[PDB]
Design a protein around this ligand. Sequence first.
Ligand SMILES: [Mn+2]
Ligand SMILES: [Mn+2]
Ligand SMILES: [Zn+2]
Ligand SMILES: [Zn+2]
Length: 452
Amino acid sequence: SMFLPPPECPVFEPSWEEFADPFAFIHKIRPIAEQTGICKVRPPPDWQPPFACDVDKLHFTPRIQRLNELEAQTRARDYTLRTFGEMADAFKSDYFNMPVHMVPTELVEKEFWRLVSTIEEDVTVEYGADIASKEFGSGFPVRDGIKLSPEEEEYLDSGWNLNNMPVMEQSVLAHITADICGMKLPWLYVGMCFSSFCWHIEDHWSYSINYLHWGEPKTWYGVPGYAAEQLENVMKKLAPELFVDLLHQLVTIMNPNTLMTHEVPVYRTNQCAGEFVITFPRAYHSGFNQGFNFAEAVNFCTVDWLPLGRQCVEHYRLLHRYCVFSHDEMICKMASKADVLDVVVASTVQKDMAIMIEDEKALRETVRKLGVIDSERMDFELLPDDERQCVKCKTTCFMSAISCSCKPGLLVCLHHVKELCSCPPYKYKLRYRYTLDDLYPMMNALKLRAES
Ligand SMILES: [Mn+2]
Ligand SMILES: [Mn+2]
Ligand SMILES: [Zn+2]
Ligand SMILES: [Zn+2]
């Protein structure tokens, strides 16, 4: 068996004027949508980006998936989009003994939840998942030195074209210098019946926007950001192995009815072709594909997200989880470009920078009281990430760190001064990006930009 479908998530149908700016629209819907974690966006009827691709020239190697509930999963032949589709269609039609399009969505959903819970069933599927590249590019029009049709030119500069969304001025991941390919570049998902995505949240508690270009629906389950710890507590009791590198993170499939039984609010939707799904910061989400389909997704960060981004990095520290990027480095990068930032962006960055400076000042005073006296300026941004992670908590260091000549190349963040080595702290060196005197003018530049 029995499945009680969770209540439906909000569906928005913006007008052209509302649709015109994705960021102003996401800000408008946020009070409603953040209460459900996920929402669906139906674009104006006439917004129809052209989808064109050669099914024989598009190649990928899919991931094999064993459909088992509470079974740990990490975050196989080569197929063309054509041969994958043939396999995907034969699979669904043989599973149900029905034409591929006559299978009710409610039936596929009930069946998915039955098959993941039954030990006797050994059903395996395949899923295509990867970043856009020369072998398999974006489903949206992109500028290329091929000639595009006026229908493609129309959607080239759209804020809803997922290639543009990250590099817009209302976004904050945009300004990031560091190569963070997994968080700025769109991901492409080629689905089949029952291929799925386990319960998870985005890196740095970012938003995600997901578009279904074509094919059969994608079924989603979402949990609001406020219920994140409640969901984790439920998952700790039932699947403890999941909790006990970044490319080694464990996720699992769990029936939304189990979460609902433990008072976790869960919402669902069937995302159809031509619709967007938006996930909000720290909103847990999972789902599965109803059949052969093609989706494109990207992470993004608004001004509203900046304080949550800081809370996230603090949470990663307590967990000893790796960061994708340094949040402080991003803030300081934007402060160094204050003259060209959007005024609302400059105002929000300035508020986060005031918190960063005050926390940094307290941390530096604390390490000085531990007897760390020597200091030297260090350009942290020049170091590869693997060269500037705290030995204890794995945080990406930017503002400051402690080193000892006895452990060359090793760093601790300022919370973990006692975790570096057994030398007395007078042997340590405080490595810092900026003095407090360099930071106050950077914050003033933001204030002047915001006050204009
Ligand atoms: Mn099973
Ligand atoms: Mn996701
Ligand atoms: Zn640390
Ligand atoms: Zn030492």
